Enzyme design. Structure first.
Site, PDB file in Angstrom:
ATOM      1  N   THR A 121     -24.612 -12.193  44.924  1.00 38.86           N
ATOM      2  CA  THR A 121     -24.123 -12.949  46.076  1.00 38.86           C
ATOM      3  C   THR A 121     -25.272 -13.312  47.011  1.00 38.86           C
ATOM      4  OG1 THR A 121     -22.207 -11.472  45.901  1.00 38.86           O
ATOM      5  CG2 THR A 121     -22.209 -13.086  47.692  1.00 38.86           C
ATOM      6  N   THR A 122     -26.141 -12.341  47.300  1.00 39.03           N
ATOM      7  CA  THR A 122     -27.283 -12.576  48.174  1.00 39.03           C
ATOM      8  C   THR A 122     -28.262 -13.578  47.577  1.00 39.03           C
ATOM      9  OG1 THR A 122     -26.995 -10.256  48.795  1.00 39.03           O
ATOM     10  CG2 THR A 122     -28.960 -11.373  49.622  1.00 39.03           C
TER      11      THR A 122
ATOM     12  N   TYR B 259     -11.096 -15.980  43.848  1.00 37.98           N
ATOM     13  CA  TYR B 259     -10.221 -17.141  44.009  1.00 37.98           C
ATOM     14  C   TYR B 259      -8.910 -17.057  43.226  1.00 37.98           C
ATOM     15  CZ  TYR B 259      -8.686 -22.015  44.252  1.00 37.98           C
ATOM     16  OH  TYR B 259      -7.953 -23.163  44.456  1.00 37.98           O
TER      17      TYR B 259
ATOM     18  N   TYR C 276     -18.195  -4.740  40.389  1.00 43.72           N
ATOM     19  CA  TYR C 276     -18.569  -5.193  41.727  1.00 43.72           C
ATOM     20  C   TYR C 276     -17.298  -5.600  42.461  1.00 43.72           C
ATOM     21  CZ  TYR C 276     -20.906  -8.080  45.338  1.00 43.72           C
ATOM     22  OH  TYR C 276     -21.340  -8.648  46.513  1.00 43.72           O
TER      23      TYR C 276
ATOM     24  N   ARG D  18     -14.589 -11.338  49.841  1.00 48.24           N
ATOM     25  CA  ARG D  18     -15.079 -12.575  49.246  1.00 48.24           C
ATOM     26  C   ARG D  18     -14.233 -13.059  48.077  1.00 48.24           C
ATOM     27  NH1 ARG D  18     -20.188 -14.510  50.518  1.00 48.24           N
ATOM     28  NH2 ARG D  18     -21.350 -13.195  51.998  1.00 48.24           N
TER      29      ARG D  18
ATOM     30  N   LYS E 273     -20.099  -1.242  42.325  1.00 50.23           N
ATOM     31  CA  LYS E 273     -20.755  -1.562  43.574  1.00 50.23           C
ATOM     32  C   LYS E 273     -19.706  -1.915  44.622  1.00 50.23           C
ATOM     33  CE  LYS E 273     -23.302  -5.294  45.876  1.00 50.23           C
ATOM     34  NZ  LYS E 273     -23.924  -6.581  45.710  1.00 50.23           N
TER      35      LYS E 273
ATOM     36  N   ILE F 102     -27.048  -1.268  46.385  1.00 51.73           N
ATOM     37  CA  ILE F 102     -27.466  -2.628  46.065  1.00 51.73           C
ATOM     38  C   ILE F 102     -27.512  -3.351  47.403  1.00 51.73           C
ATOM     39  CG2 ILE F 102     -26.845  -4.796  44.956  1.00 51.73           C
ATOM     40  CD1 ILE F 102     -25.717  -3.143  42.634  1.00 51.73           C
TER      41      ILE F 102
END
Ligand SMILES: [Mg+2]
Ligand SMILES: [Mg+2]
Lengths: 297, 296, 296, 296
Positions: free
Chosen positions: B45-46, B109, B135, B140, B164, B205
């Site tokens: 994501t980052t 989504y 994850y 999100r 994570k 992370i």
């Protein structure tokens, strides 16, 4: 240099028998707590159904707590909050007058004061007495949150305010609190996350589960305060199932049910609007209980 | 199980004139290695995985793998999708590009059920023979991998070794490790790195480690050595920057911080991500003043 | 069932030197009567019920009852508590004071179960022989009266005739009136007065009506006559003031607004309620300039 | 502005042997046309856009465009992305295939800021010259298009003509139409179709109409004709099925319902979506029995 009340503490249930406070039951349960390493008892908190007790019942359970703990190390942290500042001040003075060592003061429920209002609310309480005052933040019940800044301001501005009992499922906030004010006593009001709060520098718990398993909660807290994190986490992990099942319905409905199922109180009685749990949750509480060793009297 | 744990960095992806600055990328990874990081996570994501082409995806994994050669530092490549067929392909592709394992985000989504999430990750886990880290970031994705689903996947699939967690939910982290103490719980939430590590979590992370790799590395390794007093001291110390790095959606603040520190050359994002507000710019700069930011 | 519906006002309680300004209270009620309001609600949430003595509860119910004699305006007295024994007493007390009905808020803080809420309200309803309106505001109480519980209470108890919804949940208001179209759904949320009325709601218990009773009265009666166009137009015009009146916790903004007008002489609250911040104060003052505020 | 409004259906995408059942897709579309639907939305959320290839994306838009030629029915193609460059490409892609407009979902997962959402949609709107309907579904995307951003985009960009709201927030729908009454507010939440239309909304993009197109069509039309009594009654009647169609994540229940009614041949999804639980299967079948389902 603040006076504090910390360690393993129990939010005492209030047993009813034929609609009356079972006063002998109350004293017997408190002695049971003392005998299992508890450091302080909290009469007439949320778990004690403070909302449905009269002011005389209020005084009676504080007095029984204060008497029963006399001559022992166990302190009495009396529930004494209200969503009207004038009443909360009176209850604080009332609790001191009955020999409480300090007061737990819940954030005003229902009327949702602003942060400025919360500050003046607790400042008025703190200036009314000369015994320790622990804030009590439980936004899921009150509808408001005492901000980290407000807690820290109150800690710094008022002598008797020495910490907060957090029941907010927000470990981020407990990091925030102790990172910016490491001198305050952060107290866990959420049994399932007792260890994570203590391992971050929290200094006690005000427990629901300890009504049923005082030895286990006390041991957990003392392991953690002695920095034996491995053993404190191990008890916390073992207690997770019961810690959660005790909130399948709104506290204190499950814990009082468990206390009755274990034979520790005589009648599964509540004061409305609280009542007996569903029969499926009754069975759920009874099953989770069987996996734990429950001390007697 | 084969595992990838310890202090890990969710690498930002620097852009120059709209393209991936590959030399800056490699230089940033070397900076991570030299400051005690145990693994790097390309295209998470980052790393703005959503706006990179598959081809950029491969380029960033390869640079990560190439830059970590001759070191202990592993590459845990971002390789998730909300389409199971695509997530399987990205997993196989990440392995073929030399990744040591994959981080696989819960489908965003389309909100799969717990049954769907199980089949999703099982198909991924059976596609490769390298470690797979789940994850969970419900803020999100719009979904949550339940504790039961995580534990079932850990027990049923050889490559799945942990999760994570980026859910602001320490209760769940007790739930996870109380019922399955063999899994590797990895914090995806910098501010609560220490509470997660203190409960038996085995790594982070990190977003902040892009800016402060030495501090995140020290925090994690203190905790893994059961020096909890020293780990908490860095965690409390990092709180201000840990929060300000989320004043706008990650990675907008961290890239802003990296640019302010002179660690990347241009404050560029790919739309729909963009420069922060001028007030949040100033806020990031101000919070930065209290920290020691290593250079190259 | 006997009902109390239409345009209703949750009366503020003005203080002067820490005491209830009794003259002010009566004058404000008269102003409400004269501007088309159908019922007044003494000592509800907007009336700071939590910080009034039982003596003061009685005084404002009595003033309300006396001021509406010889008019069509009804008195729907606030009379709830999170202790059932006290809620029964306050209901009986409101009755003896001549209230036409009671508004009874869901127990706050102690979070009763749906079974507990049923027995709570059943005990109240069987205590009196006047209409009882339930009051669901989960943001303040911490609990929700489910649609099922509301419908059961409406069907099982004679006096329970509807609910004042303050939950920001138009789905629930469809649910309620789709399965029990005989109940009186009352809006407790000014901004969405019209959507609730247009779906079959039969009244409002308004905060804004303290300042603009004629506009809320007109909105409600336009809507009750299916003049949706005119009801929506007033609802749209009121949105700005409807929202600004909750920039801080009600009744802090509405009492501020009443003071900014000429309607109360002292901006006094009882702690833990207090004057707003200075920026919200100017904020309420700016928005007010857009509306025409009736006098006495 | 050029607009696409009225009763619209978010088409399911039937699969057969793992492939798009193209003849079924066309049969279903015709079914929609013959039951009074004004527009169809190929490959939206309900069409499992996330798990279709871009070629299947093209195939389902083309079938919709071809099946609606010679009729009043418009095609509002799903064409959104969480990467602006891809969303721009999909918009141009949809226009070249003959779509009458595009529905463009707010970027999911990467949570752009309000500034980023503005630039995202402005780039899309300037890419094509056909109507663009924004699509706000924060429960799935992890972000929210604010009222201000929606209004700014509507005022600044010619082809952006409204928003499909799926946020359970009637206050926001008041906010939107009170400050910008010229925009086309479209219901993306079947249960509250009538409240949104009654407040000035001009259409729905429905899940339920896949199964009951005639009922959603009549509801919408009654409402557009200001026959709110008939529109509300259909809305109330549909509430049970409207809710049961989300017992599990859409489109799992609606495809189950379509299969139960015999409108599709196979209950197939693409992972991570899958069959519902057998408890929820039975629940969908029970709720269905109360409705009259049209055939082909
Ligand atoms: Mg009330
Ligand atoms: Mg209110």
């Amino acid at each position: 240099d603040k006076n504090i009340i910390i360690g393993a503490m129990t939010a005492l249930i209030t047993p009813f028998k034929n609609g009356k406070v079972d006063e002998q039951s109350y004293a017997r349960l408190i002695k049971r707590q003392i005998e299992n390493g508890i450091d302080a008892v909290v009469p007439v908190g949320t778990t004690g159904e403070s909302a449905t007790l009269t002011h005389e019942e209020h005084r009676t359970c504080i007095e029984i707590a204060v008497e029963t703990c006399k001559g022992t190390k166990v302190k009495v942290l009396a529930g004494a909050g209200s969503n009207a500042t004038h009443e909360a001040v009176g209850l604080a003075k009332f609790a001191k007058e009955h020999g409480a060592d300090g007061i737990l003061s819940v954030a005003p429920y229902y009327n949702k004061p602003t942060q400025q209002g919360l500050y003046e609310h607790y400042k008025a309480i703190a200036q009314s007495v000369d015994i320790p005052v622990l804030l009590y933040n439980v936004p899921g019940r009150t509808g408001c949150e005492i901000s980290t800044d407000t807690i820290i301001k109150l800690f710094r501005d008022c002598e008797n305010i020495y910490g907060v009992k957090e029941a907010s499922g927000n470990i981020d906030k407990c990091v925030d609190l102790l990172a910016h004010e490491p001198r305050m006593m952060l107290i866990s009001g959420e049994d399932a996350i007792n260890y994570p709060i203590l391992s971050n520098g929290g200094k006690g718990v005000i427990s629901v589960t300890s009504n049923l398993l005082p030895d286990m909660i006390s041991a957990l807290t003392h392991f953690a305060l002695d920095e034996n994190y491995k053993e404190a986490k191990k008890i916390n992990d073992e207690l997770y199932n019961i810690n959660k099942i005790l909130f399948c319905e709104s506290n204190p409905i499950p814990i009082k049910t468990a206390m009755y199922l274990a034979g520790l109180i005589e009648s599964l009685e509540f004061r409305l609007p609280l009542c007996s749990p569903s029969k499926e949750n009754f069975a759920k509480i009874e099953e989770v209980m069987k996996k734990y060793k429950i001390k007697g009297f």
